[PDB]
Design a protein around this ligand. Structure first.
Ligand SMILES: NC(=O)c1ccc[n+]([C@@H]2O[C@H](COP(=O)([O-])OP(=O)(O)OC[C@H]3O[C@@H](n4cnc5c(N)ncnc54)[C@H](OP(=O)(O)O)[C@@H]3O)[C@@H](O)[C@H]2O)c1
Ligand SMILES: NC(=O)c1ccc[n+]([C@@H]2O[C@H](COP(=O)([O-])OP(=O)(O)OC[C@H]3O[C@@H](n4cnc5c(N)ncnc54)[C@H](OP(=O)(O)O)[C@@H]3O)[C@@H](O)[C@H]2O)c1
Ligand SMILES: O=c1c(-c2ccc(O)cc2)coc2cc(O)cc(O)c12
Lengths: 259, 261
């Protein structure tokens, strides 16, 4: 059956909740066995595992702090130990940040880059080392990397700009194992992260309700609806299929046509 | 008769301007009439030569040692710049290191060596530049054609270190606009410096089978102008960006590769 992943094993970082959760469940729905990685959300990671088993596949939750490279190594070792091999690695874990350039601290730079950029880099490295030939790597960027310009969002935007460049060159190196490497760059996608910071993207964002701010994000797409975790999961599912092979080294912005 | 793009009365700071591209930028800003703070980390004698050259052109300059990987040293650098010359108008962030390696072999240490200078360092030079600059000032960072325009195997770490800078400058321009400071980056291709000898065998197909001279010739032929990029080429563009006449270029990354892309 075309676009399915039966017999494959996938790993998704930060798939206890948000976009990662949808990606994990969806890969399972396509027939992959799934390693659900989390850092803090233990109960949520188990719910996702349960859901993947319930729809007729298999899954395991594995804790790893993706800021710690030695834990990235162990994560992948434990993934292969449990399922025997690994075919698909989706790097999804990330954090958002806002602040005028003038007040960004060393600590905030390091908090953001350590996960969004450095972490994703080494997830890709360990994915290359552990993956079977013909495999798939997908990293997560953002529409703010290149397509969308938000005041006080320089740190985060840059953290994802590095990822865009990474994936283009990763595809050159990873080709000697016929592994494709791409990134998805979502726009505003309704998750905990969305509600945490939606007031930063709108003038006087604080004087609107959360619902209003979400509605306004909806109208930034010419389809007049919000992006949802499933929208990103749908695309990742195609990229990691056999049929996605000729998309390689690319960043796909997923904003419903906002840009 | 009209003379474009001069910087008389202005004060500029250039990171890593003891040698390479930074050296040509510093001298050129001096030639345009700016007083220049010549920052270096190791190249003391070269920094003094640049200082001397700027004084010879009829301007003034001072060399200040600072390791741009250390944010507290960036802060001191800019404090000392303003203390010496009274104000600062122009900040050019140029210091960087190159790296090569297949993804599979890149270590934590190599990631940190590259990013600490190329990305983090540049970010905080920009931060300190915004805090110290006069209104109407200029910030220019340094990216690379490998960020977006040129794809080189085993160059992922470096390419990404500069991809972050491209994104930084577009958003920096939004924040820095409350002091009417423009922020841009130059993204050179292969430019003949000490760093060129690192990159040259990777930037040509089968680069390893050629001599250094041959590689330089082959890099020349990657431009439709059939010559190499030189530090002066980048200096010429930075000079325009930091002039009054460059104001409407803001938030942009300008690839400088003689039309190779
Ligand atoms: N939603 C948007 O509007 C939007 C827009 C552009 C890009 N993105 C990107 O999409 C990705 C996911 O975003 P989201 O909306 O799902 O965010 P979210 O709701 O905040 O979820 C964050 C995810 O990252 C994981 N995570 C956080 N710290 C971690 C660490 N140290 N190690 C491992 N995992 C960690 C979390 O797991 P734990 O709870 O277990 O720590 C969680 O699964 C991020 O890369 C984000 O940059 C989102
Ligand atoms: N040459 C090229 O083909 C090329 C192409 C694309 C982009 N670039 C970029 O252009 C910029 C300048 O390159 P280049 O070709 O002039 O390289 P280069 O010839 O190797 O010179 C490097 C410069 O960076 C400075 N630097 C290194 N480490 C430093 C530190 N910790 N603190 C402060 N300064 C430091 C050096 O100063 P000290 O000697 O005092 O340490 C030196 O002035 C870099 O950002 C590079 O990434 C170059
Ligand atoms: O784009 C938005 C908006 C948004 C942008 C423009 C509008 O007119 C309204 C909302 C709100 O919250 C977010 C929250 C996010 O985490 C990411 C985003 O991209 C956005």
């Amino acid at each position: 059956i075309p676009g399915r992943l039966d017999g494959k094993v996938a790993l998704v970082t930060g798939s206890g909740r948000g976009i990662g959760a949808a990606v994990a469940v969806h890969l399972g729905r396509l027939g992959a066995k799934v390693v659900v990685n989390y850092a803090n959300s233990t109960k949520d990671a188990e719910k996702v595992v349960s859901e993947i088993k319930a729809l007729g596949s298999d899954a395991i939750a594995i804790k790893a702090d993706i800021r710690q490279v030695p834990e990235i190594v162990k994560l992948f070792d434990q993934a292969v130990a449990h399922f025997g091999h690994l075919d698909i690695a989706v790097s999804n874990s990330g954090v958002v940040s806002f602040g005028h350039l003038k007040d960004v601290t060393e600590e905030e730079f390091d908090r953001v880059f350590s996960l969004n950029t450095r972490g994703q880099f080494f997830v890709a490295r360990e994915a290359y080392r552990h993956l079977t030939e013909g495999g798939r790597i997908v990293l997560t960027s953002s529409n703010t990397s290149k397509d969308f310009s938000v005041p006080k969002h320089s740190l985060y935007s840059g953290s994802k700009g590095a990822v865009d460049s990474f994936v283009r060159i990763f595809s050159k190196d990873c080709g000697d194992k016929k592994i494709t490497v791409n990134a998805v760059a979502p726009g505003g996608t309704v998750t905990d992260m969305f509600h945490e910071v939606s007031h930063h993207y709108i003038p006087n964002g604080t004087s609107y309700t959360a619902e209003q701010r979400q509605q306004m994000a909806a109208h930034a797409s010419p389809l007049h609806r919000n992006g949802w975790p499933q929208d990103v999961a749908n695309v990742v599912g195609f990229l990691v299929s056999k049929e996605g092979e000729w998309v390689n080294g690319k960043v796909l912005t997923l904003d419903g046509g906002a840009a």
